[PDB]
Amino acid sequence: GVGISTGTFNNQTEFKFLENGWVEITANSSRLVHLNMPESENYRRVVVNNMDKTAVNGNMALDDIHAQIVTPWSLVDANAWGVWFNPGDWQLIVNTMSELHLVSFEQEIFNVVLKTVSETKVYNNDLTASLMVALDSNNTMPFTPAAMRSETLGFYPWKPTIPTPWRYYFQWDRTLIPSHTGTSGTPTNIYHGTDPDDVQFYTIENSVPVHLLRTGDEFATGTFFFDCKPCRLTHTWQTNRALGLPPFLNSLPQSEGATNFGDIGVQQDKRRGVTQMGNTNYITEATIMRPAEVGYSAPYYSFEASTQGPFKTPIAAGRADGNPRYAFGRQHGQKTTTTGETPERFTYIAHQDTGRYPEGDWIQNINFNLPVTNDNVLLPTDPIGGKTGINYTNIFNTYGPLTALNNVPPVYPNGQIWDKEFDTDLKPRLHVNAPFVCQNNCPGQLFVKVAPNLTNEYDPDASANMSRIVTYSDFWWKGKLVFKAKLRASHTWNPIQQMSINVDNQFNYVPSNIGGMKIVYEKSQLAPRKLY
Amino acid sequence: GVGISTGTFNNQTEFKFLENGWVEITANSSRLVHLNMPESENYRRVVVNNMDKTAVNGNMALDDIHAQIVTPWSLVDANAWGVWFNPGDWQLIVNTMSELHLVSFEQEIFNVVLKTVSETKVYNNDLTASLMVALDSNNTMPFTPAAMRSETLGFYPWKPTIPTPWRYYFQWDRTLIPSHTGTSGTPTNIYHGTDPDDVQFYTIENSVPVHLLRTGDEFATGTFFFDCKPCRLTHTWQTNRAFEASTQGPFKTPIAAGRADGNPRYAFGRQHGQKTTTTGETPERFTYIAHQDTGRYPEGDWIQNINFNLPVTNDNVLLPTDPIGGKTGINYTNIFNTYGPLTALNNVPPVYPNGQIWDKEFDTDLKPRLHVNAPFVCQNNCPGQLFVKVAPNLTNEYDPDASANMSRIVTYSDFWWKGKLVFKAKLRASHTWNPIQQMSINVDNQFNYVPSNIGGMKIVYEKSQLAPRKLY
Amino acid sequence: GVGISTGTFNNQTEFKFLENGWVEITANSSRLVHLNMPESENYRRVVVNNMDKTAVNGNMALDDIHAQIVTPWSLVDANAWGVWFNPGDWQLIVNTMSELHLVSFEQEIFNVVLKTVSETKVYNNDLTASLMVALDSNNTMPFTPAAMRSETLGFYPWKPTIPTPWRYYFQWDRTLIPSHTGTSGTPTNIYHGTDPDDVQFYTIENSVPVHLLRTGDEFATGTFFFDCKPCRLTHPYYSFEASTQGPFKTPIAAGRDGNPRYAFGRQHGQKTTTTGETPERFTYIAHQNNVPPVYPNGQIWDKEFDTDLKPRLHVNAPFVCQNNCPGQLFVKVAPNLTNEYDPDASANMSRIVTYSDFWWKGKLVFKAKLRQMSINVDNQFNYVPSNIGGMKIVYEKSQLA
Amino acid sequence: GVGISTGTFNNQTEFKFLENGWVEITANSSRLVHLNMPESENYRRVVVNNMDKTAVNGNMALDDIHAQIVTPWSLVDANAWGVWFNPGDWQLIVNTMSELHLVSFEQEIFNVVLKTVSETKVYNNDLTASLMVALDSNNTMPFTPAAMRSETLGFYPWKPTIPTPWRYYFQWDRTLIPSHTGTSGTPTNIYHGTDPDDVQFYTIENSVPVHLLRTGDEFATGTFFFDCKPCRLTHTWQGYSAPYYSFEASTQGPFKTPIAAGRADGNPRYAFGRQHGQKTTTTGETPERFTYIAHQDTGRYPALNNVPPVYPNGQIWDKEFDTDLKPRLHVNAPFVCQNNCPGQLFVKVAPNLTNEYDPDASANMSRIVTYSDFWWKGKLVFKAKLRASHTWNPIQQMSINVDNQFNYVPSNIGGMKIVYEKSQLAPRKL
């Protein structure tokens, strides 16, 4: 009936210790989700067009033009680490466990309450109204991970949260020919409408079943089961220079201090080993053959254009090029007592040395005369196309059959957990936004809406928008996300880097006088691992 | 559903007589517990400082500096004698029993009502709203017996009661070098913040399973079972003739048996024994002069020289009259400590109605031999503290990116709490020719035990260990 | 749920004839019972003293002095003949029956309704509030026959009734030396307070269980079986003794108050449409060893004394329970508290003004043995309604033969 | 609970045909019934007296003196033909059938709604209040047929109906010597109160069980089974006489001698309101009337044949007299309940008291203004024999024609009426 609860709030996380060094980490997350009725019941098609800001030359990268289908429904997205683990739990994971698997995910909506507002304001319960709830178990709707906008559920168990108003991209065609400031004339900045071939208009009602929960009953998702490959919570330091057998040292130092270097015994042209430079006798640490290349130079801050306008070419590993910058609000880590629209921001400087240092690169001639003359070496000081600001490494790619790379580290609290794999015939090696990638199917997106609570005046033939009783709902959401992880072992003599509270970072992890809270970013790959 | 009563009120107590002179004393108690929504929904970390009062010299003892996590939850606590027994039941216990054992404790929250106020005031039901209830069965949270502040459930079956807003200590560092009036200058009185090594921020949500109870629901704490050693309800007459500081600042070194010092003074309010029709904020107070005569008497103790010449000369005897440290007012008995391998002590008596029943044993490697505040000490585990909080009834205007405190429909709950506490007690036997002292109603104490014209009750303290016992 | 009926009203009397001239008489009675909040939620101890009147010489007999524990609980008492039989049923009983046995008794509370008042006035329901009901099956609480104070349930099936606010005596000591008019000076007339040996402060909360019925729930006593002897339907003046409690009239076992004089209000037989505070009154001049039943105001049963030696008859009831008597039923609207309650504040708790209407249904079984009262022109209009809905129940004799 | 519907509306007349020429006719009827709270919760002994109108000499027939017990309870009565059969089904019955047998009657009160009125007026539900329902299965209470006061349930399934407030006769003694215009002296015209031998103050509470239906409840009564002799829908054309317009004087004043046969005198003249066949959109207080000129020629002009049915206003059944010797017929209903009759169903809304109540105050109690609406469903089962065409010629039949056409279909402003229809049509050989 009305007065009987239908579920238990639970935000614990158990660590269940299995045989042979595995821990099943069960993350439970519970949230009171608050949902206003939509602005309009009708699906809208809206084009955004900042021609005004892109027509001023040089502002090519600020291109916000897109089309989207604004939708009445709202989405409950739990795909972020902060929804599940607190800083203590994340510490216990990263400091002690070497690899991490997803196992399962499930959701429950329970204890729905519906309320109506009447004008002072009086709030009255509507026992007859219903929360409309839909689960895309089949992944027929366009996937929309809310972490890329920081519109996931809130990361504090106590605060209530709100679901993201749903929307998805529509077709559009655009050309934006770039232009520096001081260009002679206006480039062709124009919007070409939409290709009829590419139209896809989706609706929740026609695509998936919908449940009219009312105040007294639950919605529950079956246990979805992942099959993803392990994310590894440990980072690799070995550049190409640090793979294989180091040279033998003949004059070892005989006293302490940095001044007392050791020296290889024999001249560089009389050394022995394998180089991959057929015409050159010099065997050096730069020239000696290595098994393969760790990381790759990629053309940095390259913007590339399709039918739908320009976009940045992503890069798999950063050195600050490549490293991700997260901007986030007060639900999701910023100090809740701060005023102002301005988001808090961090840049995740990962530990791993799979990146590149472009200012150190160079290319030189096949002849390889040793003290290379000016005409025979292209340096990062040298201009391509006469542009002093654009050296060759900006326009340069060395991906190849020998490139080795790591998956992106987890970013706590804002980074995605899982991502859907593309339906392309040829699929990318990695996704730069989440560690785990769903191979064949991914957890169904959960859509919520409050039903149209009509008034007596309604006439469908009237042109104006329908009159609705102003309704809102609160529903408790409970998630259970299960991981399986392997405890580390101390192979080295020396201890490893670890996350720790200290005098500097102390008060980031406890509330303030007026109860303000924050969640700082914590690095997810601390222990070093052996690449070779 | 809504309209069905989900549990029965019961405040009886049953003396069920077992074989071999034992009794199962079962004490049911039931209360109407009134709960407002939190002052603010979020956890706060609040530092109290009273440098204004301690900086004036000689007021070292008045140090109140601490840090605490103010928590939206409220705590329901039954760890006090007056919750369970009325003066007649206690009379029967103290006059008839020789020893007392704790057996079991259980709880139920039942008949939850949720109500909201709209502006004059008009009062409406919210059948959809829910009371959050959490039981710390594994004792993850710090133990906080409300009896030491006199914030337990009320001691009257019929009056309603309130749960104490929960809070717990958060680590702080402090130094307060003591000084007398007439010291040269202000001594070191500074608050050093918090050691990062020691931070512990607990939340009910991350630690305890939280039950939501709408108006039709129940939450029964299952029967917990104690294993504590007996508490003697008898006092030994025989004797042998037959401030310190640590990281957090100064505290008094407790004493196990008073004569004075060492005799506990209890300050309590109108829920907890004060004449309920009194006026003003002043607490009612008693000092518990226990019967047990094992406590020493410093005004009659002296040290004398090993030579032990009978009429002592002055330099061969130390008296309480003699200064130590040049102080006219302090003598050797203040520094003197006699505790050694030979020392024997009795466990602390029960203090009706304000005293605790049980306390959690310390998780130190080496345990104290007794606790002053409770007669029973939970060794392996203790009954889980029960936390309550009405869930946030939000308005339509909520936006979590807004920094200001969330708007909430003013909501309050009245829920009935029931508990059953079981004791096992042994009857006494007359060994002496003479009778023993027994508590009774007399011409003096008569009107303490019955209401007044305007319906005002009081509960007077009653001595527990009335009958004498042989030490040896 | 809320909207489901939880019992059936019944006010029929069933005559069921058994073997050998015995007949079972089952008197069902059902009343709508109205109950306000307690005046104050606390137990009070209140002393009545009327020295203003009894200090006048010659007023020894007008001594109202006592002490009592005024209690929030209210008592539902059915212990009077008028609650069970209308005058036609009593006519059958007295005309045809020779002797009467009390067999069994049961009660139920059902169809509880709780309502609240917001001030004009609007009467909103409260489905969450509850009615406390308690039953003293073990006879822990002091026995309180409401029929002596004319405080039972009402005698008409259709008029709603109220329970009596419960109270019980607290010990006091008094001396009142009697004096006549024309005495030389004031006699000794003083109140000594209370003896500590005699103190007994009972509470319903500590002594008996309590059921917190909301609205959709019922309460039933088990059927109680009496042990009582049969009642037969066939046939120093003004000496006052001083206890420690003060002076009291010595009861006299037989008639020519003298013969018992009953004073009663509109619920209990006075013409319902008559005005004023003045009660209706009669004196029951019996024809006659044991006391007769008095219809409608007389008691049915009483409990025997706890003393070792026990009275041979009770002047106030025909039947006397020897081992134990039916449990008294107590009721109390639970505290419907406001949001501002501070229990450490001195003042009384602020309560939402709430009231309850609940239906009481009793069954009482008798056994009688078959062995005249009649309507005539003078008494004709006593047993029928008046033009404006008036009603009365006149007194009727019992030991006719 | 509250939100679940308890039973289903049904107003279908079902004709089930059994060979050997017998038809089982099941008249389902369903109504929405509206009930206000009583004027007072008290039983009241009211004497009516019109000595003013009867003191004018010659006005003996206008005598209206009686005593009655006005009762808070209200009566749901379905004992009339129009409650069950629409005119088309009645046409089928009178045209095709020859005789009828009553088989059974059952009733239900279902989907109860209780409401309260607050002062503009604002209407609120009261889920806790209850409707008191009482069925007198043992026939303890006096029999009160509502048809002769035109107080049965309404005849249209769509219009909601009200139950009649219940009342019954209390004994009185009244002498009225007759007179005429020009009589010199005032005749004896006085009221003698009542004699104690005849006093009977019945009350529902003492006589019947009562069920307190809240909102989710139903009160389905049992299935009563009649045992009456057949009623024949065919008239003889081939008698007895009596004193025209005689009045007899028992102790309870003059009353007309009923005449068992018709031709005006003997032909019953009905008078009825808007629920019971008058054009619903007519204004004014005047009732619509017809005189039922029965076809049968048993009367004479200045067993014998039974009274015919009078659709829509006439009774269906009636109690047999409790006297030792019993009448040969009743002038009001075709069927007579030989030794038991269906329980009268009494309905009341229980007192919804206010907080200020004091039962020792003399004034009337202060109740919350509450009213109920409850659905009523009944099922009346008949057993009937199809006729046979023994004559050469066709017999008279009920039919629609250009004159009576617009009696049977509604008007533009939504009006309806039910004109009477003659029941006994086919001639019968004596």
**DSSP designation for A355:** S
* Window C:345-384, CB contacts with B under 8 Å: 345-346, 349, 352
What span, in angstroms and rounded, lies between the C-alpha atoms of D367 and B382? 56
In Å, how far are D63, D188, D255 from D247, measured between CA atoms? 12, 17, 5
Instruction: Count other C-beta atoms under 10 Å from residue A294's C-beta.
Output: 26
Residue type at D106 in one-letter notation: E
Residue A452: which residues within 8 A CB-CB, separation 6 or more?
A41, A466, A468
Q: Is C309 helix (H, G, I), strand (E, B) or coil?
A: coil
CA separation for the pair A161, A166 (Å, rounded): 15
Dihedral angle computed from the Cα positions of residues A164, A165, A169 and A170, in that order, rounded to the nearest 10 degrees = 170
CB D17 within 8 A of CB D23: yes
Q: How far apart are CA C139 and CA C120, in angstroms?
A: 45
What distance in Å separates the CA atoms of residue C275 and residue C52, rounded to the nearest whole number? 30
Q: How many CB atoms lie within 10 A of CB A21?
A: 13
Contacts of B162 in chain C (CB under 8 A): 341-343
B87 touches chain C (CB under 8 A): no
Interface mutation target, options C118, C200, C206, chain B, most CBs of B under 10 Å: C206
DSSP SS3 for A91: helix
**C291-C294-C299-C300 Cα dihedral, nearest 10 degrees:** 80
Q: Do residues D211 and C2 lie in contact, with contact meaning Cβ atoms separated by under 8 Å?
A: no
Do residues B154 and B161 lie in contact, with contact meaning Cβ atoms separated by under 8 Å? yes
The answer to whether residues B211 and B112 touch, using CB atoms and an 8 Å cutoff, is no
**Interchain contact C265–D (C-beta under 8 A):** yes
Which residues, 6+ apart, have CB-to-CB distance to A415 below 8 Å? A80, A81, A147, A326, A433, A434
D114 and D329 Cβ atoms separated by less than 8 Å:
no
Question: How many other C-beta atoms lie within 10 A of the C-beta of residue C17?
Answer: 9
Whether residue C296 has a cis bond before it, omega within 30° of 0: yes
In whole angstroms, how large is the CA radius of gyration of chain B? 26
User: Residue A177 is which amino acid?
Assistant: I
Which of B12, B122, B450 is the closest to C206 by Cβ?
B12
DSSP C345-392: SSSPPPB--EEEEEEEEEEEEEEEEE------TTTGGGGS--TTS---
Cβ neighbours, 10 Å, residue A241: 12
Q: What is the DSSP letter of B220?
A: E
Query: Quick count: other Cβ atoms within 10 Å of Cβ B146?
Result: 20
Residue with tokens 């809240």, as numbered in its chain? D214
**Residue pair B4/C205 in contact by the 8 Å Cβ criterion:** no
Q: CB atoms < 10 A from the CB of D98, how many?
A: 16
Mapping DSSP onto H, E and C, the string for A195-254 reads CHHHCCCCCHHHHCCEEECCCCCCEECCCEECCCCCEECEEECCCHHHCCCCCCEEECCC
Largest CA distance in chain A: 97
Q: Please enumerate in sequence order all residues whose Cβ is within 8 A of that of D123, keeping only pairs 6 or more positions apart, or say none.
A: D115, D116, D117
**Assigned token pair, D313:** 């206003």
Instruction: Give the ranges where B359-464 is alpha helix by DSSP (H).
Output: none
Partners of B2 on chain A (C-beta within 8 Å) are 1-3
Residue to mutate among D5, D37, D39, D42, with most C CBs inside 10 A, is D42
Nearest by Cα to C207 from B84, B441, B13: B13
Mutate to test the interface with B, among C4, C205, C215, C342 (most CBs of B within 10 A): C205
B187: closest CA of chain C, how far (Å): 40
Any binding-site annotation on C138? yes
Half-sphere exposure of residue D25: CA atoms within 13 angstroms, side-chain side: 22
First to last CA, chain B: 63
Interface check B86 vs C, CB under 8 A: yes
CA distances from A236 to A317, A350, A353, A530, B161 (A): 12, 11, 7, 6, 62
Q: How many residues does chain B have?
A: 472
3-state secondary structure chain D: CCCCCCCCCCCCEEEEEECCCEEEEEEEEEEEEEEECCCCCCCEEEEECCHHHHHCCCCHHHCCCEEEEEEEEEEECCCCHHHCCCHHHHHHHHHHEEEEEEEEEEEEEEEEEEEEEECCCEEEECCCCCEEEEEECCCCCCCCCCHHHCCCCCCCCCCCECCEEEEEEECCCEEECCCCCCCCCCCCEEECCCCHHHCCCCCHHHHCCEEEECCCCCEEEEEEECCCCCEECEEECCCCCCCCCCEEEECEEEEECCCCCCCCCCCCEEEECCCCCCCCCCCCCCCEEEECCCCCCCCCCCCCCCCCCEECCCCCEEECCCCCCCCCCCCCCCEEECCCCCCEEEEEECCCECCCCCCCCCCCCCECCEEEEEEEEEEEEEEEEECCCCCCCCCCCCCCCCCCHHHCCCCCCCCCCCCCEECCCEEECC
Other Cβ atoms less than 10 A from the Cβ of A334: the count is 23
Deposited resolution, Å: 3.0
Task: Give the gap in angstroms from C-alpha B467 to the nearest C-alpha of chain C.
Answer: 22
The answer to whether D311 and D82 have CB atoms below 8 angstroms apart is yes
| Cα–Cα distance, B271 to B118 (Å, whole number) | 29
Distance CA B317, CA B302 (A): 7
Chain D residues whose beta carbon lies within 8 Å of the beta carbon of residue C36 = 355
- CA D80, CA D86: separation in Å to the nearest integer? 12
Q: Is B277 on the interface with C (CB under 8 A)?
A: yes
Max CA separation in chain D (angstroms): 79
CA distance B21 to D227: 77
Q: Is A92 helix (H, G, I), strand (E, B) or coil?
A: helix
Whether the CB-CB separation of B35 and B415 falls below 8 Å is answered with: yes
Instruction: State whether residue B320 is helix, strand or coil.
Output: coil
Q: Is the dihedral of CA D37, D42, D45, D50 positive or negative?
A: negative
The count of CB pairs under 8 A between chains B and C is 157
Give CA–CA dist B4/D265, Å, rounded: 65
A132 within 8 A of A505, measured Cβ to Cβ: no
Q: Give the span between the Cα atoms of A55 and A177, in whole angstroms.
A: 10
**Domain CATH for A206:** 2.170.30.10
**CA proximity to B4, closest of A2, A147, C155:** A2
- Inform me whether the C-beta atom of residue B157 falls under 8 Å from chain C C-beta atoms: yes
Say whether B157 and C206 touch across the interface (CB within 8 A): yes
In the 3-class helix/strand/coil scheme, how is A44-62 assigned residue by residue?
A: EEEEECCHHHHHCCCCHHH
> Which element (helix H / strand E) includes B335?
helix B332-335
CB environment D211-248: b (16+ within 10 A), e (fewer): bbbbbbbbbebeebebebebbbbbbbeeeeeeeeeeee
Contacting residues of C for B34, CB less than 8 Å apart: 337, 341, 343
Contact B124, B116 (CB under 8 A): yes
Nearest-CA neighbor of A234 among A498, A419, A13?
A498
Q: Chain centroid to CA C244: how far?
A: 27
| Count of domains for chain C | 1
- Identify which of C371, C369, C383, C330 has the alpha carbon closest to the alpha carbon of residue C142: C330
> Do D79 and D145 touch, CB atoms closer than 8 A?
yes
Output the DSSP codes for C63-128. Answer: ---EEEEEEEEEEE---SGGGT--HHHHHHHHHHEEEEEEEEEEEEEEEEEEEE-B---B--B-SS
Find residue A275's DSSP bridge partners: A288
Q: Per residue in B154-173, is it b (16+ CB within 10 Å) or e — as a string?
A: bbbbbbbbbbbebbeebbbb
DSSP assignments along A274-334, one per residue: -BS-TT-----TTTB--SSEES----TT-EEEETBEEEEPP-S-----SS-EEEE-TTTTS
Phi-psi domain of D82 (left: phi exceeds 0; alpha: psi -120 through 50; beta: other): alpha
Whether the CB-CB separation of D373 and D20 falls below 8 Å is answered with no
8 A C-beta contact, residue D73 and residue D44 = no
Domain region containing C362: 1-401
Report yes or no: C82 at the B interface, CB cutoff 8 Å.
no
Contacts of B205 in chain A (CB under 8 A): 9, 11, 30, 157-158
User: In the 8-state DSSP scheme, what is residue B179?
Assistant: -
Look up residue C127 and give its two tokens: 């489905």
The letter for the amino acid at A270 is K
Answer positive or negative: Cα dihedral of D264, D265, D267, D271. positive
Chain D nearest C-alpha distance from C103 (Å): 22
Of D201, D212, D365, the CB nearest to C160: D365
* Burial call B354-382: b when 16+ CB within 10 Å, e when fewer: bbbbbbbbeeeeeeeeebebbbbbbeeeb
Decide if D412 contacts D70 (C-beta within 8 A).
Answer: no
CA angle (D257, D260, D262) in 5-degree steps: 105
Beta-bridge partner residues of C36 = C355
User: How many inter-chain contacts (C to D, CB under 8 Å) are there?
Assistant: 152
Q: In this structure, are strands A131-135 and A446-450 parallel, antiparallel, or unpaired?
A: antiparallel
As to burial, measured by CB atoms within 10 angstroms (0-12 exposed, 13-18 middle, 19+ buried), residue B102 is: buried
Q: Is the dihedral of CA D85, D87, D92, D93 positive or negative?
A: positive
Instruction: Locate C35 and state its tokens.
Output: 């109950």
d(CA A268, CA C206) in angstroms, rounded, equals 101
Q: What are phi and psi of C61, to 5 degrees?
A: -80, -15
Identify the three-state secondary structure at position A336. coil
**Residue B248 has which token pair?**
């957090």
Cβ neighbours of C115 in D, within 8 Å = 128, 355
Site from D40, D43, D213 to mutate, C interface, most C CB atoms within 10 angstroms: D43
**How many Cβ atoms sit within 10 Å of the Cβ of residue A1?**
18
* Count of all residues that appear for chain D in the document: 430
Distance between CA atoms of residues C162 and C356, nearest Å = 10
CA–CA distance, B221 with B105 (Å, rounded to integer):
9
Report the 10 Å Cβ neighbour count for D97.
19
Which residues of chain C make contact with B449, given a CB cutoff of 8 A? 199, 201
On chain C, the residues whose CB falls within 8 A of the CB of D42 are 158-159, 272, 385, 389-391
- B partners (3+ CB pairs within 8 A) are A, C
For C:205-264, CB contacts with B below 8 A are 205-217
Q: Of D213, D43, D210, D200, nearest to D112 (Cα)? A: D213
Nearest partner of C43 among B371, B340, D84, B452, judged by Cα? B452
What SS3 state is found at B333?
Answer: helix
Between CA C158 and CA D202 the distance in angstroms is 13
CB pair distance less than 8 Å for D360 and C265? yes
Bridge partners of B125, per DSSP, are B115
Nearest to C3 by CA among C165, C238, C311, C216: C216
From chain D, pick out residues whose CB is under 8 angstroms from the CB of C83: none
**Element holding B44 (H helix, E strand):** strand B44-48
The 3-state DSSP class for residue B147 equals helix
C-alpha span between B44 and D387 (Å, rounded): 94
**DSSP letters of A403-457?**
EE-PPPPPEETTS-SEEEPP-SSS--S--TT-SEEESS--PPPEEEEE---B-TT
Q: Is A88 helix (H, G, I), strand (E, B) or coil?
A: helix
Distance CA(A296)–CA(A293), nearest Å, equals 7
Cα separation, D275 vs D83, whole angstroms: 10
3-state secondary structure (DSSP) of residue A468: strand
Tally of CB atoms within 10 A around A272: 8
B425 three-class SS: strand
